[PDB]
């Protein structure tokens, strides 16, 4: 997603305009479908993935990924600092 963010800014004359447009698109996403965002799907990540996908580059939707190795419900990964 960092690489995608850098790629999207290679076609933007002004980065502040890019941020404003992304925020406006995310706001539209949230207003149209409120219940689909806030959990595993984030609106800004969805906007970024769609803008990357609009170029023809395949990306997972909203960069939403989980851990297939979670040992059932209730178990939380303990991060190793």
């Amino acid at each position: 997603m960092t690489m995608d963010i850098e790629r999207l800014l290679l076609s933007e004359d002004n980065r502040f305009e890019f941020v404003n447009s992304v925020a406006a698109e995310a706001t539209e996403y949230v207003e149209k479908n409120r219940d689909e965002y806030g959990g595993t799907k984030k609106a800004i990540f969805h906007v970024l993935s769609n803008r990357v996908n609009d170029l023809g580059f395949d990306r997972p939707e909203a960069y939403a990924e989980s851990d297939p190795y979670k040992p059932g419900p209730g178990y939380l990964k303990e991060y190793y600092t």
Binding site: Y69, K70, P71, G74, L76, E78, Y80
Partner: protein
């Protein structure tokens, strides 16, 4: 229950295999120990097959190049060092290369001992342009990675090949930890890269078996006076002075020396040995 599974596998080429394996559930601290032991076993306890020595026939004049061969002798040895082999051979065998003339000499042009196979037959060895017969006598061994160089054959002007017996190119382990309150659980991941002479699953099994064989033998069974000084003792001056010359000051040290060492020190005789025992018996 404690189970294992292969979660990823690939074959990028014929001499590059990859695999990822899982082991769960584990208790705290077990995954690190298992990963460390498995990585050591994978990197050095697995046996590999390599060409360890080459003999050049047809009188190459022992020069840096042979007429008609594009590659030099050192280049030929470097090419031979890259050939990936697998076998079950015990001891040392011999292989032969004898190509008629012009064309490309590859791994396919090696006559092998009975147990030896070739992972990739497209590996280049030498290029021949002129119709000249090239005869090379290869020595093939099978050893562990942590092994060493055997007895050198100083004779018959045979060029050694510094073979590195590493069928497993690389290995890594990682730990994922989970928990909900007082009960914890961790997962072991093992990555294995092999040169095609072995699959990552075969490497995992061989490493486990080698570790177990390394820890079986430990279960084998078999068939069925400091404060009593010399001066306070009434000793003759001759015996007393000899003890100081040999740095003996306390009766504890006097009893620490067997009668063999007492006679060894200078100016000490058998009579003095008997005299010492009598006085000690009287005190």
């Amino acid at each position: 229950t404690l189970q294992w599974k292969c979660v990823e596998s690939r074959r990028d080429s014929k001499r590059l295999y990859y695999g990822r394996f899982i082991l769960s559930p584990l208790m705290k601290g077990q995954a690190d120990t298992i990963g460390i032991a498995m990585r050591r076993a994978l990197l050095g306890e697995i046996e590999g097959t390599c060409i360890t020595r080459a003999k050049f026939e047809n009188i190459p004049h022992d020069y840096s190049n042979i007429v008609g061969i594009q590659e030099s002798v050192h280049e030929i040895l470097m090419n031979l060092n890259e050939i990936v082999l697998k076998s079950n051979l015990y001891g040392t065998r011999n292989a032969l290369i004898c190509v008629q003339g012009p064309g490309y000499i590859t791994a396919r042009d090696i006559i092998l001992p009975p147990s030896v196979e070739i992972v990739d037959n497209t590996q280049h060895i030498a290029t021949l342009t002129e119709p000249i017969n090239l005869c090379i006598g290869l020595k093939i061994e099978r050893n562990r990675g942590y092994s060493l160089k055997m007895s050198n054959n100083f004779e018959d002007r045979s060029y050694p090949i510094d073979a590195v017996f590493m069928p497993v190119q690389n290995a890594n382990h990682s730990i994922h930890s989970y928990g909900n309150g007082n009960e914890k659980q961790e997962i072991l991941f093992i990555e294995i890269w092999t040169n095609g002479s072995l699959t990552p699953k075969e490497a995992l099994h061989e490493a486990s078996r080698n570790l177990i064989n390394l820890f079986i033998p430990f279960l084998h069974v078999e068939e069925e006076f400091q404060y009593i000084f010399i001066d306070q003792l009434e000793l003759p001056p001759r015996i007393y002075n000899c003890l100081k010359k040999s740095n003996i000051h306390t009766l504890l040290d006097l009893l620490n020396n067997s009668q063999e060492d007492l006679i060894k020190m200078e100016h000490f005789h058998i009579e003095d040995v008997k005299k010492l025992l009598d006085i000690l018996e009287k005190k």
